[PDB]
Amino acid sequence: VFHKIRNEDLIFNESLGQGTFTKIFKGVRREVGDYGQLHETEVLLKVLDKAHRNYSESFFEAASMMSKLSHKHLVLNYGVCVCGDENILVQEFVKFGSLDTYLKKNKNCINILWKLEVAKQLAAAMHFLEENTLIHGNVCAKNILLIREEDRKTGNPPFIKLSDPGISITVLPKDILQERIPWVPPECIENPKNLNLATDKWSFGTTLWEICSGGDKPLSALDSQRKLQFYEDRHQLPAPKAAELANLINNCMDYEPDHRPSFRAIIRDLNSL
């Protein structure tokens, strides 16, 4: 289970946005670290209302399950704070935040090799999950965290991590799932119980599309009703302007879940380009 963190050791600072049934804040945690040194550590605070019991259970069970699998490409969770009326996930603060807004702010100065390298790391994180038969269920560019930027000089690549899974689409309202087309796969719109490892292959493809599109949101011009009709007419996303990954995207966004390629096969495809 998660280590418990006292409210008196947490300082809440600025709001870093809102999620569906979660609030996000930058904060500070006071802690005794290695060798007994006192630290004040920047933390990311994800906050759920204790009154949303089924949402909180799904969120924190998902965070717990992924945190049992330590890995360089999976976000680090320090623990949970439960002292008041809120369940709080106390998470590592990533310097550059979520990839979707980073892409929008830097689209002009991000070339194909930066995108290829990010795709390979994300696929490596998903292969590790696939080998452990653990479903993430909410892969998107907003759930990629950028630890470190590319070093233009010393040829250092960027480095990313995958954020915690969050509330399962098996317990969310159907209208939120519909709004999350085309990240949510067509078989889960049909029935959220079809959530399966194949789900993360579809969403991975949607996430590559985000990565290659400077952080545009695919199908954002379509309201929920037309988003459904998109899946009904078996359409595929348009090739991004930088289209080098378009074939891979469409191969991943296969309407037959059993046909979506393994992440081992995705990695080999990525290495060939």
Ligand SMILES: Nc1nc(Nc2ccc(S(N)(=O)=O)cc2)nn1C(=O)Nc1ccc(-c2ccc(OCc3ccccc3)c(C(=O)O)c2)cc1
């Ligand atoms: N650990 C960490 N460190 C930092 N540092 C940081 C540094 C600078 C800046 S900045 N840009 O202000 O300067 C900002 C942050 N950020 N961080 C996070 O974890 N952020 C974070 C925030 C929201 C999310 C997130 C992702 C997906 C979500 O839904 C699923 C979904 C699926 C498909 C389609 C839609 C939605 C939701 C939700 O709806 O609940 C929330 C993830 C990560």
